[PDB]
Design goal:
Belongs to the long (4 C-C) scorpion toxin superfamily. Sodium channel inhibitor family. Alpha subfamily. It comes from Centruroides sculpturatus (Arizona bark scorpion). It is a single chain. The chain is of the alpha+beta class. It has one domain: 2-Layer Sandwich (Defensin A-like), CATH 3.30.30.10. Helices cover 17% and strands 24% of the residues. It has one helix and three strands, in the order βαββ. Strands 1-3-2 form a three-stranded antiparallel sheet, with helices on one face. β2 and β3 form a beta hairpin. The longest helix has 11 residues.
Length: 63
């Protein structure tokens, strides 16, 4: 398990508007708990899957 920014298949960091949205969406990804790191960033979870796809080197692009 590990914490980090859960990015979709194309590296789409699940952005957020409130800490609660990140916590919930965080629990769905399989994280125990997670808040919302604004600072032009995204949601932050804690407990995501080991190999969970997280920010690597992309900008979220439909393809």
């Amino acid at each position: 398990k590990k914490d980090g920014y859960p990015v979709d298949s194309g590296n789409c960091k699940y952005e957020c508007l409130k800490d609660d949205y990140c916590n919930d969406l965080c629990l769905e990804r399989k994280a125990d708990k997670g808040y919302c790191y604004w600072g032009k960033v995204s949601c932050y979870c804690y407990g995501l899957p080991d190999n969970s796809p997280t920010k690597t080197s992309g900008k979220c692009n439909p393809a």
